[PDB]
Amino acid sequence: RKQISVRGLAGVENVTELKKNFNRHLHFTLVKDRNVATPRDYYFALAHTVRDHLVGRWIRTQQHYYEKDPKRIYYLSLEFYMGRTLQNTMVNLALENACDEATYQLGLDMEELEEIEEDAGLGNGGLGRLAACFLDSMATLGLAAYGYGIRYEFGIFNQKICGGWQMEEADDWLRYGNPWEKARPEFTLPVHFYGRVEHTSQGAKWVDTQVVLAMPYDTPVPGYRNNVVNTMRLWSAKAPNDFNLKDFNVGGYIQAVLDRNLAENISRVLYPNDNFFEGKELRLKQEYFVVAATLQDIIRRFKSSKFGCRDPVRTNFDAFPDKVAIQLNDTHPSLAIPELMRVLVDLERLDWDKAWEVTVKTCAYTNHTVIPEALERWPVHLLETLLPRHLQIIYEINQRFLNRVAAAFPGDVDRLRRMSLVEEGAVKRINMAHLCIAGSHAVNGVARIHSEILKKTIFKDFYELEPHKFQNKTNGITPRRWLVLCNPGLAEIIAERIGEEYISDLDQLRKLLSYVDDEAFIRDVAKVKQENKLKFAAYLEREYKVHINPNSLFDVQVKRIHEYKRQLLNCLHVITLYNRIKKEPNKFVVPRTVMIGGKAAPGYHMAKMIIKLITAIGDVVNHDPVVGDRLRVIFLENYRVSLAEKVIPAADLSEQISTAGTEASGTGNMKFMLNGALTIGTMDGANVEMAEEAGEENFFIFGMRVEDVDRLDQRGYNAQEYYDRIPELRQIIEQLSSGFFSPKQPDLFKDIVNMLMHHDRFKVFADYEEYVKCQERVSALYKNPREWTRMVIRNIATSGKFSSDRTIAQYAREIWGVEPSRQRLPAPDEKIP
Amino acid sequence: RKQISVRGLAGVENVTELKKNFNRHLHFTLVKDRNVATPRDYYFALAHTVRDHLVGRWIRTQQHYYEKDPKRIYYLSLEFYMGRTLQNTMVNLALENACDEATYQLGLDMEELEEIEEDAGLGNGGLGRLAACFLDSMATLGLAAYGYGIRYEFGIFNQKICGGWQMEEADDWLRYGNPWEKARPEFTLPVHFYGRVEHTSQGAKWVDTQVVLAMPYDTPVPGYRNNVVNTMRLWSAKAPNDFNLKDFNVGGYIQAVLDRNLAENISRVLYPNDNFFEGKELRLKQEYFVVAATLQDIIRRFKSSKFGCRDPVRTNFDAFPDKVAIQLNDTHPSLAIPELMRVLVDLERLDWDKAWEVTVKTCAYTNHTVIPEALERWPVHLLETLLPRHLQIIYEINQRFLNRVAAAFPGDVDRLRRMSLVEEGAVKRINMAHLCIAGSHAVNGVARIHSEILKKTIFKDFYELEPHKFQNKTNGITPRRWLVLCNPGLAEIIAERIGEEYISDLDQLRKLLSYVDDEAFIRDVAKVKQENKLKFAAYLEREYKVHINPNSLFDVQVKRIHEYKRQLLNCLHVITLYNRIKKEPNKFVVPRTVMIGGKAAPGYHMAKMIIKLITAIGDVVNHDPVVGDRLRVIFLENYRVSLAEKVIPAADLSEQISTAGTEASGTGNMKFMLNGALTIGTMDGANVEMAEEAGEENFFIFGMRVEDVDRLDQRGYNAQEYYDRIPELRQIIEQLSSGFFSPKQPDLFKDIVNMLMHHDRFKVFADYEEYVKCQERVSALYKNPREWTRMVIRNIATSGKFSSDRTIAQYAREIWGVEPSRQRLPAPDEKIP
């Protein structure tokens, strides 16, 4: 509808420079002319002109580190959920407004072109987005940091609801190209698979291995206005030419060539599994592949440092921990630990015990869940086929480890079977979380309760052996994408009162508590959210047709569709709302639009069932005339980062409803809090630190605390109890059991009814009384709008702790041992020296 | 050693412009800086700066044709053997010398960088190079022409001789990228496979087909200094997202994604088969794929023309032949004919008989061989599975065709089984050469005897039915790559006397007969060849080590290794030479370096055997001390276009030794003739028109003419006869039979001995007397150097007829019906209008 904002300066020479370079790429890069270039061609010419302002800084940031050669942070993750890159790169370079003017005086709209860009969907959700937000934060804090992972040809599937069912389809995100990567095939590396271990004369050798090659592609990761542009290096698999062809004595020349895309399948697709574990060979291959190739790039750079010169010399890998820190995001790169031992002992010839001190001091591990089906416990027969030397290194690590445990708790023979990284049984397995605690020097959780639950439950044995290892580092979100970029209007009205230094110092938002009684600030804050609601209802009417009321409470739960996350409890609540105004049709109720969105992993039947329940409910509700427009249920299709930048600004209520003690942190919860939604949520994850930051009076907590959850388990949860005692709940179950919500096929929802009644791992009935109660308290407040905005102003004003710049400044200081910085690196300028 | 030449002007502003743009791409495109950029990075910055001078012209050449909208020539070929593109694009734009100065004053050597570029090996040999030379000629003659084919990820394999055996390896030519193509994914197209034909109400429909998508990549094809830049559009296969994923009810989400590279295998690899026929499903798929997608691009452009406006209107496909000419290179795109009928009848609803007149008038076919194992005769069961509607269209074409034949030769029932496009028998098959003659309006051969042999033997029946169809268009070579570019020194000394207009008017070389007695020209012509010999002996010493004598006759046969080409006869000759100076060690013989190079198709055992024989001979010869350096045998490894640009300038004698009546034309023979080698060859292929052009006295013809070959077949060839009567031949066979040439495994060569003796399809013994005789006559002349250079000056001076510009000016006029032109299109200059 309009905007100027402080998306930086649109100054005379630079708007001019821009338009020229735009027209240059459309011709020379695109080989398209004005009369034939479509909005996608206009998108790539600007994408190409914005990455031109980035290579100068990138090249100088990387030669800079060679010259100073800091300790280098390697963030190994198998997921990186980046979303789109043009506007984020414009924000961090301060080009937002010069390219908006430039595009204006060239007759295009930036926002049309910005919507053309495909999201890079290299992640499933929150572990992968945490990685993407960390990368922004490490560059904004001047850290010599490199994010490393796999370049998946197909990222997370694109979800389509057909007949209300999720239909998954392939994310061919590279179809039109990627202007942001730079393929580097000169730097390809081998990764060995299979083979045998010969034991001779001096050491072991892994022999007769198969060779896949690792082709790196680098993406720049620009800091917020400080001229640092760090790197995301993502490996692609390529078959070699000699073995992947020559091994002879008949078998088809064409067949040997077509069989190459079988080694290259290692990076074809991301595994789409939310908090579950799949013991598939292709996954362990992907896990070894990014470990092997990355550790070679690590050592290469450590062998230059300045030791490839001197500092001492006579290859002292002693200094390896003072030059390298490798962060394992979840156990997916836990083979970084046996592999660092392999290259150091086998290839580099250090003694076991030196190379162990060097491995534990450079590695650290971030635990992401306590739900036991998520734990990777790879069967031993898999590892002996695929990685026979690494298995060997794991057995010797385990041997030596349990010798520590038995020394320290002598005689405690059941502790020994519990702490072992080898899980005995029918299928002998390797417990990778155990590997990670044995070979890292810092193990951390993602939120204070999740960190305490690790010390007290899941890893109490390891905590008693080595209390010094366990840490907590509560998650964060980046203020640049999650505020500046999806909510420019909220950021400009904050910018107006307190300035802009808060975008890399979010704790400053607390100076906003002075304006909680300002009537100009209250009205502005509230107009921004009504505007946001209004542009999203438009988006919905446009891209997905639907039409909703902008004057309702926009109640939204968006995250992956898992039972512990409790889209079902939320569901039960909206079926109640419906039933209550059907009983009393002519009662005023605060009108609300409830929007649930998220993806199910392919073969998770319950999750596919819940998406069918939600769309089945909106089939009844959205078509009942007595309901009018007072209640609408919208399933939000193909949830991902660009849609989260659209929804979370338009939200009034944020559903963070998991059973206490299951969500380790959550980060969706933090994003909604700096964007002026109010939380309704259990004392779970970081919801506890958020309520603690704003004050419990300003948050809408309900439900069972974790102590009450264990008490109910001690007792035994009996869901028939809640059904019997609560008539509104009984009525809802029967409606489900009789086909009220599935007419032409009445027994349709009997899997979900049977579960809630008899197999509810997450206790949905136990929290239903206190949940519809709490929900009556947000509607009470909604219709006292000035007092909702003042509660909102106290949530927004207390979001500081949930910046990823604070989380990274604490890993930096207490795990990696580097000091952050914000001194901007010298200006982009020219010089080829 | 030095050069200035007339590689155009190196003028002040433009050398300056160049260096700046070089440094621009190395930074912004390459993201490499001077201190870290290798010679490959320097190659891509110049490749990128030379294609910058080409997009202006390309875009304006293509909008130009839209505006004037000529008849458009579509050259459909499954092979296109382009070799490398930088220097060829510099020649045609006149940038050779500005970029040589530019690179000089930047401290690099062009020739180092020019050697970095990978050859685009999208062809096997001569059919594919003919296509590549035609494209140059069509752009140099201002024709609205488009070359269409498949973009193979792997081209022709790279050959490596290990233990003297060919080892084939994959040509991953795209590893480092291609700076010359422009991917156009917005223009992807579907190609249907499998399915069924429903017959209902109005017409047939091909239903339940599988869908592969065709992703086009365009390469510019610049004319010689006339600002036309035409297009090579090459299709790539891409799996769709919906069917290649959704078809459900359990079967693995990861499996559905990994199974996509199975539709994309259609463009993975070129079939490496020289004049043979493989009836494999993947080949017919590749053949339908480039036909389907191309015919859609043809019709699209015919539906704009100006009829998508008017000219008449009420969709008159009548004018289709006056707007389109599609040339089928060999029978590999013969499905262009049933497919043009399918879209016109089934989709476009014309009557059969209108659409047949429109198909025969737009299609034309070039026959490339008479050797019967080369003929594609696709089994009927293959086509009914894969293309069931097309099979149907072929049966109805055949029905209607034989009704013409039987009307015109009433009662001649064996003619009817001979002319049928359906070859009855155990495996019923479709004769594709027959398809092509029924549905083209011009059928042509590639040289005057090959054209006569078609009218008299292989296609006499079709010639009697339709004499008007049969034509001849003798092959050509492009004077720009095959003279200007690999022989700048020979081109500058010609340029000195007669000027340079000969590079697009090669017939002008005849004004060189005036200098056949010029002693300055004789000495220059001879110094150029000694220089060339000297740089190739260096190349050999460098890249392949070998060391040879530059003062010998460089005797070279380079082409594919097939029995009809007769690398064995040449072999028998060098074993004789060896034996003769072993008999008489101290006889002066003219010293010669014999170089045989070329690739065998993978499973062609005889061809793999002949490469082993040749390297086995050089094992004896190159190590015999009594031989001294008087004779050396060099097998020329990994023969291809860039090596042919190195060898053919350095050649003194050119071996064009096939059994008369088998090589249809040959083009290697023409390249050697404009580069000052003298031919020894049978009266075969275009060797007959070449001898005829220079005078038989100036050529070294020997051997059986084709009449003598049929006489010997009438009689029955008995190779024991030649063995018995010729002692030098008897001695050679015994040396082979006893392991003289294969010591540690004596029976090694008994496949080749057994064949020559009992199964010689190509009569190698029949031509051996006259061949070692003719070979004594070139050595006689070699050691009268001034009289060799004067014979050479009469071959070079009479090469005009063998330009591809003459061949294309005759297809243009007598088959496609367009007039060539040489008026340069307006200067590249600016304007976005």
Ligand SMILES: OC[C@H]1O[C@H](O[C@H]2[C@H](O)[C@@H](O)[C@@H](O[C@H]3[C@H](O)[C@@H](O)[C@@H](O[C@H]4[C@H](O)[C@@H](O)[C@@H](O[C@H]5[C@H](O)[C@@H](O)[C@@H](O)O[C@@H]5CO)O[C@@H]4CO)O[C@@H]3CO)O[C@@H]2CO)[C@H](O)[C@@H](O)[C@@H]1O
């Ligand atoms: O060359 C060095 C070394 O080699 C040899 O030892 C190696 C073993 O031969 C090899 O099999 C491998 O051993 C693994 C073992 O395979 C694996 O099962 C695992 O065993 C653990 C259990 O996982 C753990 O639960 C616990 O089990 C006990 C438990 O205390 C007890 O309470 C009861 O419940 O059952 C079990 C029986 O006591 O402990 C065991 C180990 O005690 O871990 C092993 C080590 O990873 O690797 C060995 C090291 O390379 C030679 O035998 C040895 O002498 C040489 O020093």
Ligand SMILES: OC[C@H]1O[C@H](O[C@H]2[C@H](O)[C@@H](O)[C@@H](O[C@H]3[C@H](O)[C@@H](O)[C@@H](O[C@H]4[C@H](O)[C@@H](O)[C@@H](O[C@H]5[C@H](O)[C@@H](O)[C@@H](O)O[C@@H]5CO)O[C@@H]4CO)O[C@@H]3CO)O[C@@H]2CO)[C@H](O)[C@@H](O)[C@@H]1O
């Ligand atoms: O709906 C239109 C049309 O449909 C029906 O005809 C179709 C046929 O049913 C269908 O099978 C197909 O016919 C093909 C035939 O399958 C194929 O074998 C081929 O036959 C040729 C031989 O290839 C050729 O050698 C020659 O063979 C004769 C030969 O003259 C003779 O000397 C002796 O040696 O042997 C053979 C027996 O006489 O000629 C035959 C054809 O005479 O070609 C056929 C046509 O392509 O396609 C038909 C057309 O769609 C109905 O039968 C018909 O009435 C309708 O008009």
Ligand SMILES: O=P(O)(O)C[C@H]1O[C@H](CO)[C@@H](O)[C@H](O)[C@H]1O
């Ligand atoms: O992986 P490396 O070698 O440390 C970093 C690579 O990218 C940097 C930024 O483009 C270049 O300065 C460097 O020369 C290049 O090799």
Ligand SMILES: O=P(O)(O)C[C@H]1O[C@H](CO)[C@@H](O)[C@H](O)[C@H]1O
């Ligand atoms: O599987 P999810 O929820 O997308 C992501 C998981 O990792 C995130 C980042 O550590 C946590 O905040 C979240 O609680 C945890 O369940």
Ligand SMILES: O=P(O)(O)C[C@H]1O[C@H](CO)[C@@H](O)[C@H](O)[C@H]1O
């Ligand atoms: O295949 P088409 O559409 O005929 C030719 C294509 O390339 C030409 C040269 O870049 C462009 O002018 C044209 O707009 C484009 O669509």
Ligand SMILES: O=P(O)(O)C[C@H]1O[C@H](CO)[C@@H](O)[C@H](O)[C@H]1O
């Ligand atoms: O298989 P080859 O020899 O490489 C190529 C084939 O097509 C060429 C181009 O029409 C002919 O000149 C040649 O005689 C013929 O055998």
Ligand SMILES: *Cc1c(COP(=O)(O)O)cnc(C)c1O
């Ligand atoms: C931040 C984010 C998540 C995380 O959601 P939680 O509520 O923490 O589970 C998942 N998906 C996307 C698209 C995100 O933006």
Ligand SMILES: *Cc1c(COP(=O)(O)O)cnc(C)c1O
């Ligand atoms: C021209 C050429 C050919 C053709 O050789 P012929 O002697 O006609 O069989 C084959 N390969 C390459 C590399 C060529 O340059």
